[PDB]
Design a protein around this ligand. Structure first.
Ligand SMILES: NC(=O)C1=CN([C@@H]2O[C@H](COP(=O)(O)OP(=O)(O)OC[C@H]3O[C@@H](n4cnc5c(N)ncnc54)[C@H](OP(=O)(O)O)[C@@H]3O)[C@@H](O)[C@H]2O)C=CC1
Ligand SMILES: [Zn+2]
Lengths: 86, 340, 126, 114, 208, 95, 134
């Protein structure tokens, strides 16, 4: 039906989260003004790989890998999430 | 629900089941295995006994400490019943006599005592009552047993509106009077029947199936007020049933027809002693009574019990009667009896 | 040569006679036992301990004792290092969790600080 | 990783020994039903022996299956020589035990067990 | 120290130290450590490949003559990777003495049977099969001797609980004494008795 | 000093008596609940307060080596008597 | 009413005020017929035809790691960075401060001993309140 929440997991000190860090350091705020009613939960953890969880209606949760991605690639994956609504 | 009767544990011997049972007639055949099966859940079982305490001794290893409480009772005594059932939450009635005595006919055992127990269990606040009637119990039968037991069925149903009435068809076991009766007419003269016993049809039900049915009747709140008919999975004629009895025990077998001219008079010829009777005329009229089929009643399939047939337990029953020359035999030696 | 090569996982869960119910449903806990704060001694906080999860303890209806159904309830094993305890828990297949040794920080106690000039750490009495 | 073997060099001889032990039990079961005068059948006994062999089916360690062969030989010697009784053979057929919960909902209903 | 303290036997300590050096310098292939206790007893800690070649020395050598096997013992210690500590106790009637030979194994390594040296161990290590699970190869009748016949497990391992996993009760249904999972009427109340103050300073283990 | 429940059952000195709907009175049907009837809390109230003239009194329960271990009781509280920790006796500085 | 478990009565992941996840252990079992809370919710999901994909507590913890992976790493503080983006998002809604003073409702010693569902049901806390208000 439609997207309900987004979960962006990342590390603090891994280089594999670096471009994922580059999504939040420059591109998060104007995203949040664009989606003010959409909870995008950012979770930092110890040594996890970056991960994207998209929860839809009736409990469906898409599972997108985000390791070794630049900020352009994270942005393209997240706008695919925002445009799919599957 | 009260805090001491909350079920705890992993369902073993020292667990708590949440069942406080008063098992009348517990010192017989069904009460033996019923106290055996209730005591392994940790149920506080009140056993009212009329007989010698020594005859109740085999009920003592069936539970934990304080999980079986023995007490005296009389059948014509309202005080003993009210003294025994006031703390329970299920009252099972297994009181029966296969033969009438000087002090008790079938009317005392099947009409007076079950109505007294059901009346007291209503007027003392017992949530579950369970009565045990016979499957062939009818108002106009030719036997005193089935007539008094159908009248007691109707009375227990109408004076306690949620009494779980259970109809076991014909129970066989170790201390029974069904296979032990068919095997202990061997040296009397040749296993008498009427028209060679091919005119009456039985389905024997196994006693562990009946006991698990009573357990699942205690457990199930859906099983309140029903009238269950416990039957075995295989129906047999009497003739090939007695073929299978004398073929598991490896015995000689020469049956003969003994007609109605003199096979009701062998009662008063063969209970001239005042002791425990071998046969009687009611036993003659019940062995030669077919098992009626009542498909509308719920059975062992409708309480989650797989009914175990005759052939898997008849060797367990009838190993006792082999002399010596085929005690080292098997179950894979005798061909199973013909069903109908 | 009289020596065979075994690179498989060292597992004896079929040799200790333990039923399956007390292997895949029990949570072994490896921990340095914390000091009892009633007391000041730390000799009990020297060796690692492996305990297990507590199953149900109910009231016996005869007396009021704590009846139980768990055989491994009273089992507390003693180990010296964390690696021996982890290798033992992976030897018998028990699903385990490991707490760490939390030694106290070495305190900077100074008796002159009880009688300072300008510090707040003076005592109001002695 | 170089430890001393028990009887088998690798998995092949260990499978041979497990196989001969299963041969011995397959030969044994009718005698055990006969002389102990049990109430079970040879089909039921041999399927229970199949269940007892398949209970340990996940082991790839040769020393462990060697010790399982040896303990099966101990069970076999306690069964041929009449040292087990009727009860020690019928302890495998857990008949007096009530049927235990398997799914989540009944284990939720009866107690706190995971 | 006069009424209550035990008198120290320096003669036994010096003689057992000399005999420990003797057994050490004869057998450097298997003898790992040699220790003498403070109450004058000798312990020859060896390797499990030297079960037969050490004992056959002590059974036969003219200055050992340990002809008697007093007691064979296994001690399970869970924190070691070789968890079982098999203990031989030998009595020499001519030299009026005792020696202790201590070997080790885990659950899977077999220890060589010493029935060829001392037939007395024909039950003892057999008991160590039953009580611990240490396998003794080249043993004639190696089977369980103290537990029941339908006993699965090994009791004196310390991961085996105090009460077992089965209880026996008679059951009138199958007319038989059957085994069911144990439910104790009173739990075995474990007492945490270890006081946290160091009782013996001379036995202190130095830290990490 | 035993009193009686409304169910029909005696009361211990602890304070235990079963409910009306608790099934564990069925162990007393046909038998008797053996309770003690010499309640210690009602027998220690009959002891008069020992009027002594010291500040610290030494109580051992009498008998010497047959009583409780000997303790010392301060009696400077005049509002409250000095109750012995073991034996339940109590003392009073009379001034 | 569905009776639940306490904090001494379940293995249970809590979080303190600094983001450190911790777990309890079962001291006693829950009294009566009361079950553990997620067991109850999972049984309700089984009855309602919406069966959740777990049976055991470790699978609940794997689900918890899917939702936020810092809740399976016990006794570890993770430093939450990025104050600047939250600061920039706080500049949007210029909410007006009231003139009413910031007065917390826990002013005295009376307001401490009875706060939550356990401390109101204690006779010891009742003695503490009766002792500090006399
Ligand atoms: N044919 C069958 O087996 C079937 C039987 N039933 C019914 O199931 C019940 C149980 O059968 P079963 O176990 O085989 O019978 P039993 O003869 O083996 O046992 C009956 C018990 O009832 C007691 N009892 C009977 N009458 C009195 C009395 N007047 N006063 C005191 N105690 C009495 C007996 O105790 P005591 O020794 O003190 O007299 C005995 O313990 C019976 O009601 C029977 O009709 C149902 C279906 C099939
Ligand atoms: Zn005193």
């Amino acid at each position: 039906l439609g997207l309900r929440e987004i979960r962006i997991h990342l590390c603090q000190r891994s280089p594999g989260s670096q471009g994922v860090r580059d999504f939040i350091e420059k591109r998060y705020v104007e995203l949040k003004k664009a989606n003010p009613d959409l909870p995008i939960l950012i979770r930092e953890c110890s040594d996890v790989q970056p991960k994207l969880w998209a929860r839809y209606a009736f409990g469906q949760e898409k599972n997108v890998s985000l390791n070794n991605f630049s900020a352009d690639q994270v942005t393209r994956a997240l706008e695919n999430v925002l445009s799919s609504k599957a | 629900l009260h805090h001491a009767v909350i079920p705890h544990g992993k369902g073993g011997r020292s667990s708590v089941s949440g069942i406080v049972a008063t098992v009348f007639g517990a010192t017989g055949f069904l009460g033996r295995y019923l106290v055996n099966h209730l005591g392994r859940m940790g149920s506080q079982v009140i056993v009212p006994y009329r007989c010698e305490p020594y005859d109740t001794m085999h009920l003592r290893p069936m539970g934990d400490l304080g999980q079986i409480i023995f007490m005296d009772w009389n059948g014509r005594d309202k005080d003993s019943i009210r003294r025994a059932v006031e703390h329970s939450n299920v009252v099972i009635n297994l009181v029966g006599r296969e033969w009438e005595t000087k002090n008790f006919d079938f009317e005392d055992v099947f009409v007076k005592i079950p109505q007294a127990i059901a009346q007291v269990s209503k007027e003392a606040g017992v949530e579950k009552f369970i009565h045990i009637s016979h499957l062939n119990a009818d108002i106009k039968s030719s036997s005193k047993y089935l007539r008094n037991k159908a009248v007691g069925e109707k009375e227990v149903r109408e004076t306690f509106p949620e009494a779980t009435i259970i109809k076991p068809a014909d129970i066989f076991g170790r201390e029974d009077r069904f296979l032990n009766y068919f095997a202990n007419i061997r040296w009397f003269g040749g296993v008498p029947l009427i028209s060679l016993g091919k005119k009456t049809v039985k389905q024997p039900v196994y006693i562990v199936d009946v006991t698990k049915g009573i357990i699942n009747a205690i457990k199930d709140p859906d099983a309140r007020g029903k009238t269950f008919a416990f039957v075995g999975p295989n129906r047999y004629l009497l003739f090939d049933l007695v073929q299978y009895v004398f073929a598991v025990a490896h015995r000689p077998f020469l049956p003969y027809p003994m007609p109605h001219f003199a096979y009701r008079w062998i009662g008063r010829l063969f209970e001239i002693s005042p002791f425990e009777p071998w046969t009687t005329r009611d036993k003659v009229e019940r062995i030669h009574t077919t098992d009626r089929t009542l498909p509308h009643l719920p059975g062992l399939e409708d309480l989650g019990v797989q009914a175990t047939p005759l052939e898997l337990k008849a060797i367990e029953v009838l190993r006792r009667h082999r002399t010596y020359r085929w005690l080292s035999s098997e179950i894979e030696d005798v061909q199973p009896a013909k069903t109908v | 040569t009289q020596l065979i090569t075994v690179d498989e996982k060292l597992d004896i869960t079929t040799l200790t006679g333990v039923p399956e119910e007390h292997i895949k449903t029990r949570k072994a806990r490896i921990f340095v036992p914390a000091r009892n704060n009633m007391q000041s001694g730390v000799n009990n906080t020297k060796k690692w301990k492996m305990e297990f999860d507590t199953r149900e303890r109910w009231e016996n209806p005869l007396m009021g004792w704590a009846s139980t159904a768990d055989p491994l309830s009273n089992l507390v094993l003693t180990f010296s290092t964390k690696e021996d305890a982890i290798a033992f828990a992976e030897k018998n297949g028990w699903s385990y969790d490991v707490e760490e040794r939390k030694v106290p920080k070495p305190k900077s106690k100074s008796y002159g600080a009880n009688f300072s000039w300008n510090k707040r750490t003076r005592v109001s009495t002695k | 990783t170089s430890v001393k073997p028990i009887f088998s060099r690798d998995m092949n001889e260990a499978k041979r020994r497990v196989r001969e032990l299963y041969r011995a039990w397959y030969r044994e079961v009718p005698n055990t039903v006969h002389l102990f005068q049990l109430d079970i059948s040879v089909k039921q006994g041999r399927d229970k022996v199949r269940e007892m062999f398949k209970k340990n089916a996940h082991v790839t360690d040769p020393r462990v299956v060697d010790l399982l062969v040896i303990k099966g030989k101990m069970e076999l010697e306690e069964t041929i020589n009449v040292w087990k009784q009727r009860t020690h053979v019928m302890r495998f057929f857990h008949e007096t035990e009530a049927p235990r919960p398997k799914d989540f909902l009944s284990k939720f209903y009866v107690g706190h067990d995971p | 120290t006069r009424p209550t303290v035990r008198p120290r036997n320096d003669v036994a300590h010096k003689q057992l130290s000399a005999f420990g050096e003797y057994v050490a310098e004869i057998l450097p292939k298997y003898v790992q450590q040699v220790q003498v206790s403070c109450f004058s007893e000798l312990e020859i800690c060896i390797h499990p490949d030297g079960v037969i070649p050490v004992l056959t020395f002590l059974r036969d050598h003219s200055n050992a003559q340990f002809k008697s096997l007093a007691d064979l013992t296994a001690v399970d210690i869970p924190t070691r990777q070789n968890r079982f500590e098999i203990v031989y106790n030998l009595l020499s009637l001519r030299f009026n003495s005792r020696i202790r030979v201590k070997t080790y194994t885990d659950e899977l390594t077999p220890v060589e049977s010493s029935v060829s040296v001392y037939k007395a161990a024909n039950w003892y290590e057999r008991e160590i099969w039953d009580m611990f699970g240490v396998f003794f190869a080249n043993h004639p009748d190696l089977r369980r001797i103290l537990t029941d016949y339908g006993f699965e497990g090994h009791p004196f391992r310390k991961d085996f609980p105090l009460s077992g996993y089965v209880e026996l009760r008679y059951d009138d249904e199958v007319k038989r004494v059957v085994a069911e999972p144990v439910e104790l009427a009173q739990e075995f109340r474990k007492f945490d008795l270890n006081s946290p103050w160091e009782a013996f300073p001379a036995y202190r283990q130095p830290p990490e | 000093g035993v009193r009686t429940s409304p169910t029909g059952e005696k009361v211990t000195h602890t304070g235990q008596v079963y409910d009306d709907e608790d099934y564990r009175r069925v162990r007393f049907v046909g038998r008797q609940k053996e309770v003690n009837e010499n309640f210690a809390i009602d027998l220690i109230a009959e002891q008069p307060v020992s009027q002594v003239g010291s500040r610290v009194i030494s109580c051992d329960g009498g008998g010497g080596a047959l009583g409780h271990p000997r303790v010392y009781i301060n009696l400077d509280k005049e509002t409250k008597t000095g109750t012995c920790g073991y034996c339940g006796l109590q003392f009073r500085q009379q001034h | 009413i569905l009776p639940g478990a306490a904090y001494t009565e379940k293995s249970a992941t809590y979080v303190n005020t600094e983001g450190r996840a911790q777990q309890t252990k079962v001291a006693v079992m829950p009294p009566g017929l009361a079950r553990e809370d997620w067991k109850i919710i999972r049984a309700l999901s089984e009855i309602a035809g919406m069966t959740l994909p777990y049976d055991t507590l470790d699978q609940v913890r794997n689900r918890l790691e899917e939702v936020s992976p810092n809740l399976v790493r016990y006794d570890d503080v993770e430093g939450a960075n990025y104050f600047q983006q939250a600061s920039e998002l706080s500049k949007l809604v210029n909410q007006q401060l009231l003139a009413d003073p910031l007065v917390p409702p826990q002013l005295t010693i009376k307001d401490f001993y009875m706060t939550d569902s356990i401390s109101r049901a204690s006779q010891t806390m009742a003695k503490c309140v009766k002792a500090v208000t006399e």
